[PDB]
Structure formats: structure tokens, C-alpha cells
Amino acid sequence: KLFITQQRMQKIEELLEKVCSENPLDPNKTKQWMKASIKLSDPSKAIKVKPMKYSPMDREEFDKQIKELLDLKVIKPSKSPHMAPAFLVNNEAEKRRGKKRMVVNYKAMNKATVGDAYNLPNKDELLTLIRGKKIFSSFDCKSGFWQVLLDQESRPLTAFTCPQGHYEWNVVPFGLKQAPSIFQRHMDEAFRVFRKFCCVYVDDILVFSNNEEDHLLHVAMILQKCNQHGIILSKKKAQLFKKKINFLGLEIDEGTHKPQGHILEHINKFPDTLEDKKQLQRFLGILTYASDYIPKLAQIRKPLQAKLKENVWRWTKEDTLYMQKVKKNLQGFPPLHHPLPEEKLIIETDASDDYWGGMLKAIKINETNTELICRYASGSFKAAEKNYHSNDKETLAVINTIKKFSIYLTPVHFLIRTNNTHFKSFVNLNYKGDSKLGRNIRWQAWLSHYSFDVEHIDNHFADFLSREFN
RNA sequence: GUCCAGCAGUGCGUAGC
DNA sequence: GCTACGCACTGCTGGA
Incomplete structure (x- = not known):
């Protein structure tokens, strides 16, 4: 007997091993593909920040971490005219990791360098890509920015200070403003060809498929892509073949999503x-x-x-x-529905004197259909908006809800349910009121970019919550 | 203390009425 | 007084 599927799993596991390492500059696993350039924009000036004071517990750990960093050959001794202070940070990730994290204050040098125009993805435009998918794997690069080599004229700009002195970086350090863009550019270039089953947020590669079979192929192609480009993954952080995956702070399912x-x-x-x-x-x-x-x-x-x-x-x-x-x-609010690409979408909106609210619903198809809740939105009215008439607050609630949900709603014909009986005439440019014309034409213009019908108006969780509070 | 992102908020300038 | 757009700054959280 073959068990060709278990053979494919071991092949995946070996590709994974081939591209993992604890050293982002691993000489057997990098091609030095990724390079970056950081420019002053007024090269004449020198960016010197006053150093900081260091306690013994910190002067000790710094010594440990600096030897590590020096050992990885990510930093080196520096005589650079620029300098920025290093310090340690202990937030909730550090507490649970067991190690304090070192940060260089690059605010001054960030004000002083030419920006990188390359934009990061929007979190909603990535999540909408995985609607319907059944199986996921996720891969974090190992200390990703440190895999991007800085050229000779850019490394002095990274020079920092710490108890042991004055060092600079051979690679892109955390905390420079250009770093997420530099890395995202590279990930997009390596992986855009697989956009149909793979997306990247800077550091994090997600693979998504609608079944295990496809996934064996999908993961293997991504892993062979990392190898081709010398991209080093972090084995400890690999999430392999999961039905529920952690991504972008969410726990995402084929049908559901919640915060981690x-x-x-x-x-x-x-x-x-x-x-x-x-x-x-x-x-x-x-x-x-x-x-x-x-x-x-x-x-x-x-x-x-x-x-x-x-x-x-x-x-x-x-x-x-x-x-x-x-x-x-x-804690313990129910997970919410992650709607299928083809499911019809509804927004129900409401308003009160000082707040607006809205809720996104999807129509799950059953041979009698069902309406599932996907997402909530709420906010309070601006200063000028509390003087709006009760029909216009209801319209504002519509606008704010669409804005929050716009990545999902924009490409689709959806359904708005509101209590504004005149909302229907308003969007059909048939609205009588000329009192606040410029604001109304502004809203009519903005709503024109959406395709939708209108209805007039079963959320028992919201009924429970309101009962339990006042 | 950086940077990205989340939530709330403050100030300012330019343009139009 | 209003609107718009876009710059600067603040507090806290998550995380790299």
C-alpha cells in the first residue's frame, strides 16, 4: 500500500526544515536576495540623539543580547556620525516569551529619512481573500527585517548606542519607518504569483485552500518559493495544516472568526x-x-x-x-460568521441621540434560508452631528456602517435595512429637503458609489446586553 | 521610549461658503 | 459659524 498522502506530508515537513533556521543570516539558507536603501534627504546633517542611562539588570542583559547580535553579525562596531539610543521593553509578548525586547529610538532618524512609498495591505482586503477556505497554514519569517541587507551608505544611519557603546546594523533594523514597506515589497515580489492561495502581511505568510488535497500542493509551492529566494522561516511559529488559524489577531474558521x-x-x-x-x-x-x-x-x-x-x-x-x-x-461573546464570497450581505443600522450602530449580516442558504451576524460597528456622533435631525442621524448611521464594512460591501449588491422611511427617496435623488443641500449632495454622492436596495425595520445577544446593563 | 496596527482624543494650517 | 483635506501631537492596547 502507498499512503501517498503521508508521503506528501513528510515531503512538506522536509521542505519546511530546509527553509527554517534560528539565524536570519544563515549562510546555508540565504542567497542575500533582499537588499534595501535608506536615504537622509539632507545628507549634510548628522542625527545625534543624547544617550540614555542604564540600570545594572539592563546593562547585563544588553551585554548578553549584544554578543548574540554581534555573533549573528547583524550588528557591528560603529564610528558613525549618527546615533540613537537603545533600550529594553517588557510588554505582554515579552512577559510570556521570557525575554526583554531591545528597541532603538529612531524617531529622529525617521523624521530625517526619505520615506518608502510602498503601502502595506489593508487587513480587511486580506481577510476577504480567505472567505470560504477550509484549510490554512501560516509562516512567520525569522526576524524578517534582519534578513534584508543594508548597503554601505545606509548602515551608518542605523548606528545606535547602548551600555557597551556605539554599534550600527548590517541589516534592516526594527523601528525604522521604511522597514515594513521594504519587507512587504519583497514578500509581494516573491509570492504575488501565488496570490490565489497565499497572502502576506509584512512578516506573516498565510496559505489558504478549500481542501487538504489542494493544500499539500499549495504549501509545497510556498515552501519551495522560500527556498528559491533564501527566505528563512521560524519553525517554532509555523502553523501547519490548521482548520482554525491565527492571523491578524483573529482566530479564523471556514465559517467563523473571533479575536485571538x-x-x-x-x-x-x-x-x-x-x-x-x-x-x-x-x-x-x-x-x-x-x-x-x-x-x-x-x-x-x-x-x-x-x-x-x-x-x-x-x-x-x-x-x-x-x-x-x-x-x-x-469574554465569551460568540464567534461571528465569516461570510462566503457568494453570500448576500445585509447591513442593519440604527441611531440614538448620541450614538450610531450597525450590524453586518449574511444570508446563509438552506433549502428556508438563514441570516447570520458577521460584524458590529458603533460610534458616537461628532459635535455638529448631535444637532442633526433624527432622520439624518439614521442616515449617518448608514454611512458610518458602510464605511466600516466598505471592503466587503463595495463589490457587491447588498441590502440596507434602516428606520428612515425617507432614506429610500433620498438615495433615489427624490428627496424634498433643500435646507441642508450641500451636506445632502455630499451624502448622495458618497452613497452613489454603492449598489443596494432599501428595506424598513433576531439580535437577541444585543437584547440580552441592553437588558443586563440598564 | 522605536515601528506597525487597534480604539479614543487634541491642535493646526490651507482651500471654499 | 460651516465644509473639506492634511499636517502635528496625546493616552492606552496588540505585536514585531
Whole structure:
């Protein structure tokens, strides 16, 4: 018996081994393909930032990390006229990685260099590409920027300082403004030919297929592409043949998507009683990652945002009991539908005195159909917009929802459900009101770029949440 | 402390009424 | 007073 499929898996596993390494400059695995150029734009000047002070724990670790970096031959001793300070950072990735991360403050040199015009992808334009796919693999480059060689005139620009002195970089360092663009350009050049089953966000390669069979071919082609170009992957971070893949901070399924669980876990580390305002802004910061997933989250967040104002610190038993509910639903909100390419899309929108809301729905086809929720949007009205009439806030809710969902809606005939009985006449340029003509023509122009019908207006999760809060 | 991205916000200039 | 577009800056989070 053959087991030709297990043979293909071992072949994939060997291609993976062939392109993985812990050294981004690995002499057996790089062709020195990727090169970059960084230009002052006023070459006459010198960019000198005052150094920093270093504690012993940091002066120690620096010594360890600098020997590593010197050993990889990514940095080297420098007598450059430019200098930028290095420091260590300890954020949630570092805490769990077990190692402090070194950062060079390149703000001054970034102000001072010619930009790279090359744009990064939009996260929604990548996600819409994988709608319908069943199987995924994902690959992070090993310290990717460090695989791009800097030419001789550009390396002095990278010179930094640290306890052990004055070094510069032989490769593109993290923290330069051009680096994501330089790397994205290279990944697009290596892999654009496989755009039908592969996309890259800077650093991260995603392979997607609608079944295991295709995937064996798809992954092998990407891995043989890395080998051809000397692109070094990180074995520890390879996600091979997964039904659920982590990508762009999301957990994505054939039919569903949610934030990565390890992100919204940190909500449950906050107390029900916040000590100070600085901790409240830490809390609001992470609560941000639920906006696509909680209906009317702008409102839920407003009571808390108030406390942040300098004008206002007084925590109450209600403040405490508010935290508890908020914490309970900001973890364990249900995953949302990732719509198939051919599924018909609907947006339902609503408005209140101070906020707008909208919700994206898809029509799952069943031989009686079904409407699945894909994404939520919410926000509060600008200063001038609170004086809008109640029909125009409802129209604004339509516009803001489309804007948020525009990557999905733009190429498709979709359906808007609103409570503005005059919205239908308005978009058909049949609207009577001449009072605010310029704003109306502006909206009519903007809405003209979309193709849609209109209906007048089953979200029990949102009904639960509203009940449980007031 | 950089950089990308998420969320909220502040200021400013230019152009039109 | 309004609109627009686009520059500068701030706080927090995620991560490289």
C-alpha cells in the first residue's frame, strides 16, 4: 500500500526544515536576495540623539543580547556620525516569551529619512481573500527585517548606542519607518504569483485552500518559493495544516472568526474596582479589541470614558458592578460568521441621540434560508452631528456602517435595512429637503458609489446586553 | 521610549461658503 | 459659524 498522502506530508515537513533556521543570516539558507536603501534627504546633517542611562539588570542583559547580535553579525562596531539610543521593553509578548525586547529610538532618524512609498495591505482586503477556505497554514519569517541587507551608505544611519557603546546594523533594523514597506515589497515580489492561495502581511505568510488535497500542493509551492529566494522561516511559529488559524489577531474558521483568545484573556486580569484613572485607560485600551464583536459597544464604553476626563476620581458600588458585567460579556461573546464570497450581505443600522450602530449580516442558504451576524460597528456622533435631525442621524448611521464594512460591501449588491422611511427617496435623488443641500449632495454622492436596495425595520445577544446593563 | 496596527482624543494650517 | 483635506501631537492596547 502507498499512503501517498503521508508521503506528501513528510515531503512538506522536509521542505519546511530546509527553509527554517534560528539565524536570519544563515549562510546555508540565504542567497542575500533582499537588499534595501535608506536615504537622509539632507545628507549634510548628522542625527545625534543624547544617550540614555542604564540600570545594572539592563546593562547585563544588553551585554548578553549584544554578543548574540554581534555573533549573528547583524550588528557591528560603529564610528558613525549618527546615533540613537537603545533600550529594553517588557510588554505582554515579552512577559510570556521570557525575554526583554531591545528597541532603538529612531524617531529622529525617521523624521530625517526619505520615506518608502510602498503601502502595506489593508487587513480587511486580506481577510476577504480567505472567505470560504477550509484549510490554512501560516509562516512567520525569522526576524524578517534582519534578513534584508543594508548597503554601505545606509548602515551608518542605523548606528545606535547602548551600555557597551556605539554599534550600527548590517541589516534592516526594527523601528525604522521604511522597514515594513521594504519587507512587504519583497514578500509581494516573491509570492504575488501565488496570490490565489497565499497572502502576506509584512512578516506573516498565510496559505489558504478549500481542501487538504489542494493544500499539500499549495504549501509545497510556498515552501519551495522560500527556498528559491533564501527566505528563512521560524519553525517554532509555523502553523501547519490548521482548520482554525491565527492571523491578524483573529482566530479564523471556514465559517467563523473571533479575536485571538489570548488577547481578550487579559481583560479578566483587571479588578472589578479600578484603583486610578491610569489603570482605567489600560482597561479601555484592551477593551478596544472587542469593538467588531459587541453590539453598541460605544455606549457600553462611554460611562467608563467619562471617568478619564481631567474635569472629573470617584469609584462607586455601581462602578464596581458595572465592571463585572462588562468583564463577563467581553469574554465569551460568540464567534461571528465569516461570510462566503457568494453570500448576500445585509447591513442593519440604527441611531440614538448620541450614538450610531450597525450590524453586518449574511444570508446563509438552506433549502428556508438563514441570516447570520458577521460584524458590529458603533460610534458616537461628532459635535455638529448631535444637532442633526433624527432622520439624518439614521442616515449617518448608514454611512458610518458602510464605511466600516466598505471592503466587503463595495463589490457587491447588498441590502440596507434602516428606520428612515425617507432614506429610500433620498438615495433615489427624490428627496424634498433643500435646507441642508450641500451636506445632502455630499451624502448622495458618497452613497452613489454603492449598489443596494432599501428595506424598513433576531439580535437577541444585543437584547440580552441592553437588558443586563440598564 | 522605536515601528506597525487597534480604539479614543487634541491642535493646526490651507482651500471654499 | 460651516465644509473639506492634511499636517502635528496625546493616552492606552496588540505585536514585531
